[PDB]
Amino acid sequence: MTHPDPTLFGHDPWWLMLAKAVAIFVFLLLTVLSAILIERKLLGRMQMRFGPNRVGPAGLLQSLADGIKLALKEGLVPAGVDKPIYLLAPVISVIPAFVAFSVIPLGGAVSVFGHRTPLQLTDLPVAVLFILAATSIGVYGIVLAGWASGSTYPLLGGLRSSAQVVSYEIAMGLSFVAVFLYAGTMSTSGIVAAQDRTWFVFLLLPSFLVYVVSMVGETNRAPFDLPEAEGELVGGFHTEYSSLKFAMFMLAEYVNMTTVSALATTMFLGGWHAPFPFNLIDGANSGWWPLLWFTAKVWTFMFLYFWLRATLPRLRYDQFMALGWKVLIPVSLLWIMVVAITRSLRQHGEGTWAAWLLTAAVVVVVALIWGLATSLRRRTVQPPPPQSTGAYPVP
Amino acid sequence: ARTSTSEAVVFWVVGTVALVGAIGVVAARKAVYSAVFLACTMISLAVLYIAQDAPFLGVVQIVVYTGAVMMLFLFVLMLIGVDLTESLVETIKGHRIAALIAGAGFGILVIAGIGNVSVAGFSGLAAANSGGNVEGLAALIFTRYLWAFELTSALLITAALGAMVLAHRERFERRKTQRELAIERFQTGGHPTPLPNPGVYARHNSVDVPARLPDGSESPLSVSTILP
Amino acid sequence: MALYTPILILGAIAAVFAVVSVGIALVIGPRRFNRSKLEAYECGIDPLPPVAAGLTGQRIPIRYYLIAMLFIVFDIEIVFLYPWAVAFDSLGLFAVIEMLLFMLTVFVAYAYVWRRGGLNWD
Amino acid sequence: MNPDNYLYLSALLFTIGAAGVLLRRNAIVMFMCVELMLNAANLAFVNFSRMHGQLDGQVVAFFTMVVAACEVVVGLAIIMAIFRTRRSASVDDANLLKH
Amino acid sequence: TPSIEYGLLSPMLIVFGVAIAGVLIEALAPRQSRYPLQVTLALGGLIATVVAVVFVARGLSGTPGRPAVLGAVVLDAPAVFLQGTIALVGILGIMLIAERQKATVSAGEARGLEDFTPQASAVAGSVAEQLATKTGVMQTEVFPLTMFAIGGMLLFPAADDLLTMFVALEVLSLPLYLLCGLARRRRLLSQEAALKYFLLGAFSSAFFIYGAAMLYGSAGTLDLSGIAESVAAGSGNTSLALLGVALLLVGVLFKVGAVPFHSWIPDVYQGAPTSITAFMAAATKIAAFGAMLRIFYVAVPALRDDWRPVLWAIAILTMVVGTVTAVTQTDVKRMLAYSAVAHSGFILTGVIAANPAGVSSTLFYLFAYGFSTLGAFAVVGLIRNAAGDEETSMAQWAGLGRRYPIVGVVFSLFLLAFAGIPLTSGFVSKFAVFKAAGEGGAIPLVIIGVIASAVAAYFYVRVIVLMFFTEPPDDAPELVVPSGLSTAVVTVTAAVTFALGALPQPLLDLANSAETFLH
């Protein structure tokens, strides 16, 4: 009915909701450790290597080793930095990263210590935009870190972060529109419930693709990776940062990856609902199994991140902004129309017309985008004219 | 009228942050500090909106003002300076005192005009938000205020047109492409072939150091003309 | 209060974690003053004499300023879709047509910007 | 807490924003102060909407946000145009029209 | 579903659709054809609008107006009268805006006679600007912007809700902010004018919205009729109502140009393009005073005893400071701006009347004065120095009439209309407003306005002295026609100014019929 369901949310006792908050925080910490370790090992495998397999049994302690080493490493405060904002920027990056995850549905209702509570820290009438707002706040961490370092390379990194925001944020926002249309709510729990019949990834594929591209953009991950851009700006924004300040920038990056992958899972992959091979199994969607399914989907998205990093080079941030504004935003807006018209027609019994329009629309878009990829980006040009340098004779 | 003590504490802390943020926006000597304080004020006001049973409004505030303050910070770097510290010395004789007096008087008079209002009754918004705050906002926007909603499109078009007319530069001044610059009698590489690097000395290797010509004089071309 | 105090608790946990992490950075591990260490990283080259010109005491032009200005308005405008999207079923055909007209107006603006080279530069 | 406090805060914020427009030469800071003024108006609208048990004030706050964004963009365009010629973003620099 | 009165909204709908279509022309029309379509689209679009208005007027011969969009818009007789006035003034202003260079050997005439720089983003005097001028390029995006301004202004009198009124204020303000900075000549002054106008307009609009918030808190409603019901029934706070009325008055007074808020008008009118200044000084004044009329005759009549004393002072100041400051002015455009301030004061005297005679007098005053101001500024735009810049230095106008008797006589007619001499629409106009004020118990305002008019006649007459009684200087300016559109605008404006002076009962019956707002 109404989402968030008042019979489930807003009733956890102080101790239980504190326990859920601590559990979510610890889950994010463990997931960040695992994300780093598994990413390094998977990059190794995709590059025929083994990755960390010596620091602890099978390298399990490598991520913890790196974290504690950064803790045990000198905390630099370079001269010429805007010290207050320079020290705050890591905190500004971190806090929203954790906050955003508060409205992620990790599972359905479950009974713990005699209380029926959602396997979810909380839910809001506007939860998805709450996540978007938290992530948007988080980018000020990157930008102010770049600016406050008082050096050229961090400044360029922060400027690239701002450009990346301009590139991806509107597309991210427009991606949620179709999800809301089909779910009829902004609550994450309501969106998950709306996907009981089918996952929105099948229904809202263009929205899913735009959102995924915007996810990779938001997390400053390859092939976008612009604010860091190791090969270009040395360290990008987090240059001039060392020890746990850099550690916290990277922690915020990975927590953002996890949060936005979980948001993708919630909005498109049916949240915590069991996949088809397990959906037929009784009790799979109940109890603590939804946690397993949600983690599996989130980690498939993490695998997508790692695979993109291993396979693709990084775009120029002008090219990323061109992708955002000439492809992503127009595609998402056309899809928003198409979806609205389709749903309105279906609600009025038009039937076949919608089934036509939708297909035609996508048939057009994939062609038109192809043009931008092949026609607009012409691969021919005229020869240059000679000059005083007495050029040789060409073949 | 009274609000929940939790809401009272939320208001006190968050509105203290918002007031301090506005004061910083007005008083910060670095424009970037002003932008950061504006972001703080906007986020605090969003939290207050949430506290006042306007969740959608607060969240949208956070999102759009995060974007807008980011853009304003970009324009601060572009037009004022990366870390320029403004003087804030009154350039108009007696204007500072007069402005402070006028501001204080206006604020005092506005507060006096407001007086006690909630004493006249304070309806709980729970009745309206019942059925969804966003649902109610949608019902009002597209039924009672669809005209203003549509006119916001005219506002957007006017903003875009102004940007395109005043800020967008055109062909007569488009920067030369790397291909264009390379092809200028082969200017880029053969016309003063890549300029001599800044001189490298023991105790000095920065880009501001000119190179030494054979006669012992500093080569002008070694150091970029902009550098002091 | 409910439905938000969990967010407040998680935010408190995260803020304590982050501030304590900064404190640990500053307080755990060796600390040794060194002027070369503290000065700005410049790929190993000496930082420019402090002064101020053509950078920190100057401005860094962004060549996508136009797209930033457009981003402001477009971001603030699209948020109309969210209440429309959520209440779509309840509003009915009239609201669908109204939002389609609004979206077509936004499309006219976008097309004018795009076709007149507004999305050029960075 | 008495809800009317929210209005006083707005009255302060608006006031501060007004003072900012008088005190700061930078055009961008002037835009920030105008945004402060409009958001103080939004806070007053939200408080009154809560007071009257209806969402109309919230809708007005939304529309004020739209107006603030559009006005900021137009002001930024004007300031770009001025700066490209004068290489300055100070309001006091545009002093030619006088007396 | 919400019933939409498209017929009633046909005005402002033609205009906004035409503005959108003009933006489409900018987007996807070849350069060489952009201006012919835009001017064809703009002018025709306004002509249609005018027709729509009269049709709506006929529709209103029955019920005394009606809401259109479930509130938020009301087309009553005052609203339709003001919308027709604004449509006509917009037609004339666009005819001014579309004027190109008179002629040249090269075909690249670039809408310059209308003072519009070929590329506003180009640096003033830069090689890019010179090259753009030589190539004959010109930013036709001006025409859509104007439409939007007209659109917003057309809505501003008709807005029946605070939110819609605020949105219309912004919609008309932003295009004007942009247009004030597009002057072809003296680009530095035009950019300064645009910046000043933007800053002060944003300031005033912030005050406007804060006042709307105060009013909403007092009455718990945004509809003007609802606020009237709240204040009359005493259910409101009655302090927030007054504070909101004051803060809203701040915005509307800024738009009309009262002395506490007039300072922007001189600089903006001097710096802005002459055609844009001519169009704006009429249309914006008309729209702002229409909104003020709706506020003070629909929204808050009950608090007349509370806000009437304030307006008095404003009006008084506006009549005194507006006129006295004009006495020593040496610039024609700046002097006309101060005249606009003083005439805002004269309008406010009639608005204070708080009687149907006040509404009729204000409507007629706005019509006649919008026409007169548009014509005066159009004529000012034709006086060109040797360098080609609009010769506004009043001393340089010496002997101008002795060289151009037709234009000199037309400008003298406009000046005497501003001074309020009988046999000019300006006198009938001033008499209407002062009569309304006297009937409304404000005869002290009538006396003060009479003294202010006596003062202002001096600086209105000094121009005629220089034009006709003085010999031309050696380097005296010359007229640039420059095309049929400008001549048509000047002729129509002078003809209206003379006819409404000699034979005012036409359109005065129309103003009388528009004495009643829909409550």
Side-chain angles (χ1 to χ4, degrees), chain B residues 196-202 204-207 209-213 216-217 219-224 227-228, chain C residues 48-49:
Chain B
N197 50 280
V200 172
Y201 300 71
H204 303 296
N205 56 30
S206 52
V207 302
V209 179
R212 189 181 291 165
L213 289 175
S217 64
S219 56
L221 300 182
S222 57
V223 57
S224 174
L227 285 155
Chain C
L48 201 62

Short mmCIF file of all heavy atoms in Angstrom, two decimals, chain B residues 196-202 204-213 216-224 227-228, chain C residues 48-49, unseen atoms left out:
data_model
loop_
_atom_site.label_atom_id
_atom_site.label_comp_id
_atom_site.label_asym_id
_atom_site.label_seq_id
_atom_site.Cartn_x
_atom_site.Cartn_y
_atom_site.Cartn_z
N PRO B 196 63.32 27.12 -25.27
CA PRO B 196 64.27 26.57 -24.31
C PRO B 196 63.63 26.40 -22.95
O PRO B 196 62.86 27.25 -22.49
CB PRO B 196 65.40 27.60 -24.29
CG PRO B 196 64.78 28.85 -24.84
CD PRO B 196 63.80 28.38 -25.85
N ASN B 197 63.93 25.29 -22.30
CA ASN B 197 63.36 25.02 -21.00
C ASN B 197 63.87 26.04 -19.98
O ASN B 197 64.91 26.66 -20.19
CB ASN B 197 63.73 23.61 -20.53
CG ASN B 197 65.21 23.32 -20.66
OD1 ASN B 197 65.70 23.01 -21.74
ND2 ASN B 197 65.93 23.43 -19.55
N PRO B 198 63.15 26.24 -18.89
CA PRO B 198 63.68 27.09 -17.82
C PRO B 198 65.01 26.55 -17.34
O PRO B 198 65.23 25.34 -17.28
CB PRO B 198 62.60 27.01 -16.73
CG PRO B 198 61.80 25.80 -17.06
CD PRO B 198 61.83 25.69 -18.54
N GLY B 199 65.92 27.46 -17.01
CA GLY B 199 67.25 27.06 -16.62
C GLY B 199 67.23 26.20 -15.37
O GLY B 199 66.42 26.40 -14.46
N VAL B 200 68.14 25.24 -15.32
CA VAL B 200 68.30 24.35 -14.17
C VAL B 200 69.61 24.69 -13.49
O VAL B 200 70.68 24.54 -14.09
CB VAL B 200 68.26 22.87 -14.60
CG1 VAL B 200 68.61 21.98 -13.42
CG2 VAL B 200 66.89 22.52 -15.15
N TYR B 201 69.53 25.14 -12.25
CA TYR B 201 70.70 25.51 -11.47
C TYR B 201 70.70 24.73 -10.17
O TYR B 201 69.65 24.31 -9.68
CB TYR B 201 70.71 27.01 -11.14
CG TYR B 201 70.73 27.92 -12.35
CD1 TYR B 201 69.63 28.05 -13.16
CD2 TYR B 201 71.86 28.66 -12.65
CE1 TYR B 201 69.65 28.88 -14.26
CE2 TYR B 201 71.89 29.49 -13.74
CZ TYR B 201 70.78 29.60 -14.55
OH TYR B 201 70.80 30.43 -15.64
N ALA B 202 71.89 24.52 -9.62
CA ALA B 202 71.95 24.08 -8.24
C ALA B 202 71.27 25.12 -7.37
O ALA B 202 71.55 26.31 -7.46
CB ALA B 202 73.41 23.89 -7.81
N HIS B 204 68.17 25.89 -7.66
CA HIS B 204 67.06 26.51 -8.38
C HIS B 204 66.78 25.70 -9.63
O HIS B 204 67.62 25.64 -10.53
CB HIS B 204 67.37 27.96 -8.75
CG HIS B 204 67.70 28.83 -7.58
ND1 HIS B 204 66.79 29.11 -6.58
CD2 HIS B 204 68.83 29.49 -7.26
CE1 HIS B 204 67.36 29.90 -5.69
NE2 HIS B 204 68.59 30.15 -6.07
N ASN B 205 65.59 25.10 -9.71
CA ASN B 205 65.16 24.43 -10.93
C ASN B 205 63.70 24.71 -11.26
O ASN B 205 63.13 23.99 -12.08
CB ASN B 205 65.40 22.92 -10.83
CG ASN B 205 64.72 22.30 -9.63
OD1 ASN B 205 63.68 22.78 -9.18
ND2 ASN B 205 65.30 21.24 -9.10
N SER B 206 63.08 25.71 -10.64
CA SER B 206 61.69 26.01 -10.91
C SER B 206 61.53 26.63 -12.29
O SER B 206 62.50 27.08 -12.91
CB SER B 206 61.12 26.94 -9.85
OG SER B 206 61.95 28.08 -9.70
N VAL B 207 60.29 26.66 -12.78
CA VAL B 207 60.03 27.19 -14.11
C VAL B 207 60.28 28.68 -14.20
O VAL B 207 60.35 29.23 -15.30
CB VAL B 207 58.58 26.87 -14.54
CG1 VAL B 207 58.34 25.37 -14.52
CG2 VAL B 207 57.59 27.58 -13.64
N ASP B 208 60.43 29.36 -13.06
CA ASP B 208 60.66 30.80 -13.06
C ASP B 208 62.11 31.17 -13.29
O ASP B 208 62.42 32.36 -13.37
CB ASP B 208 60.19 31.40 -11.73
N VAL B 209 63.01 30.19 -13.40
CA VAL B 209 64.44 30.46 -13.51
C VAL B 209 64.82 30.52 -14.99
O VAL B 209 64.63 29.54 -15.72
CB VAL B 209 65.26 29.38 -12.79
CG1 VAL B 209 66.73 29.66 -12.94
CG2 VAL B 209 64.87 29.32 -11.32
N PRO B 210 65.37 31.64 -15.47
CA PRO B 210 65.79 31.69 -16.87
C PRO B 210 67.06 30.89 -17.11
O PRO B 210 67.88 30.69 -16.21
CB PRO B 210 66.02 33.18 -17.12
CG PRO B 210 66.39 33.71 -15.79
CD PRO B 210 65.62 32.92 -14.78
N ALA B 211 67.21 30.42 -18.35
CA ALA B 211 68.40 29.69 -18.74
C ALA B 211 69.54 30.65 -19.06
O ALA B 211 69.32 31.83 -19.35
CB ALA B 211 68.12 28.81 -19.95
N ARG B 212 70.76 30.14 -19.00
CA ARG B 212 71.96 30.95 -19.20
C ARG B 212 72.44 30.83 -20.64
O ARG B 212 72.74 29.72 -21.11
CB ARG B 212 73.06 30.53 -18.23
CG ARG B 212 74.25 31.47 -18.22
CD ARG B 212 75.32 30.99 -17.26
NE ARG B 212 74.89 31.09 -15.87
CZ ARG B 212 75.49 30.50 -14.85
NH1 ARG B 212 76.56 29.74 -15.02
NH2 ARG B 212 75.00 30.67 -13.63
N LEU B 213 72.50 31.96 -21.34
CA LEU B 213 73.08 32.01 -22.66
C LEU B 213 74.60 31.89 -22.56
O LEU B 213 75.17 32.07 -21.48
CB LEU B 213 72.68 33.30 -23.36
CG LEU B 213 71.22 33.41 -23.78
CD1 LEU B 213 70.92 34.78 -24.35
CD2 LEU B 213 70.87 32.33 -24.79
N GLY B 216 76.53 34.42 -20.68
CA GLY B 216 76.21 34.57 -19.28
C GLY B 216 74.91 35.29 -19.00
O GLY B 216 74.49 35.34 -17.84
N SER B 217 74.25 35.82 -20.02
CA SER B 217 72.99 36.53 -19.83
C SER B 217 71.83 35.55 -19.83
O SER B 217 71.89 34.46 -20.42
CB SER B 217 72.80 37.57 -20.93
OG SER B 217 72.69 36.95 -22.20
N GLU B 218 70.75 35.94 -19.16
CA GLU B 218 69.57 35.09 -19.07
C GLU B 218 68.79 35.14 -20.38
O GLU B 218 68.50 36.22 -20.90
CB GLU B 218 68.69 35.55 -17.91
N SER B 219 68.46 33.98 -20.91
CA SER B 219 67.71 33.91 -22.17
C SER B 219 66.25 34.27 -21.91
O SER B 219 65.59 33.61 -21.11
CB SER B 219 67.80 32.52 -22.77
OG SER B 219 67.35 31.54 -21.86
N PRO B 220 65.71 35.31 -22.57
CA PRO B 220 64.29 35.63 -22.34
C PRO B 220 63.34 34.50 -22.69
O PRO B 220 62.34 34.30 -21.99
CB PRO B 220 64.07 36.85 -23.24
CG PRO B 220 65.42 37.43 -23.44
CD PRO B 220 66.35 36.26 -23.48
N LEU B 221 63.64 33.74 -23.74
CA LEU B 221 62.72 32.70 -24.20
C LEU B 221 62.63 31.54 -23.22
O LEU B 221 61.67 30.76 -23.30
CB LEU B 221 63.15 32.19 -25.57
CG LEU B 221 63.19 33.21 -26.70
CD1 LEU B 221 63.59 32.53 -28.00
CD2 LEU B 221 61.85 33.91 -26.86
N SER B 222 63.59 31.39 -22.32
CA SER B 222 63.61 30.22 -21.45
C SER B 222 62.45 30.23 -20.47
O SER B 222 61.89 29.17 -20.16
CB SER B 222 64.93 30.14 -20.70
OG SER B 222 65.16 31.32 -19.96
N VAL B 223 62.07 31.40 -19.96
CA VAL B 223 61.02 31.53 -18.96
C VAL B 223 59.80 32.14 -19.62
O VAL B 223 59.91 33.10 -20.39
CB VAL B 223 61.49 32.38 -17.76
CG1 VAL B 223 61.95 33.76 -18.23
CG2 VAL B 223 60.37 32.51 -16.74
N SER B 224 58.63 31.58 -19.32
CA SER B 224 57.40 32.06 -19.93
C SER B 224 57.18 33.53 -19.61
O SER B 224 57.44 33.99 -18.50
CB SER B 224 56.21 31.23 -19.44
OG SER B 224 54.99 31.77 -19.92
N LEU B 227 55.44 34.72 -16.31
CA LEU B 227 56.08 34.61 -15.01
C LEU B 227 56.81 35.90 -14.66
O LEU B 227 57.49 36.48 -15.51
CB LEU B 227 57.06 33.44 -15.00
CG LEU B 227 56.40 32.07 -14.92
CD1 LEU B 227 57.30 30.99 -15.49
CD2 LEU B 227 56.06 31.77 -13.47
N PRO B 228 56.70 36.38 -13.41
CA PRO B 228 57.42 37.60 -13.00
C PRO B 228 58.93 37.49 -13.19
O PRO B 228 59.58 36.81 -12.40
CB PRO B 228 57.07 37.73 -11.52
CG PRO B 228 55.79 37.00 -11.36
CD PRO B 228 55.87 35.85 -12.32
N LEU C 48 57.10 26.96 -7.43
CA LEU C 48 57.31 28.33 -7.89
C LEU C 48 57.48 29.25 -6.68
O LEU C 48 56.82 29.04 -5.65
CB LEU C 48 56.14 28.79 -8.74
CG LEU C 48 56.36 29.96 -9.69
CD1 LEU C 48 57.41 29.63 -10.73
CD2 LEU C 48 55.06 30.34 -10.35
N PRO C 49 58.35 30.25 -6.75
CA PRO C 49 58.51 31.18 -5.63
C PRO C 49 57.15 31.64 -5.12
O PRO C 49 56.23 31.86 -5.92
CB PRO C 49 59.30 32.34 -6.25
CG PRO C 49 60.11 31.70 -7.31
CD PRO C 49 59.29 30.56 -7.85
#
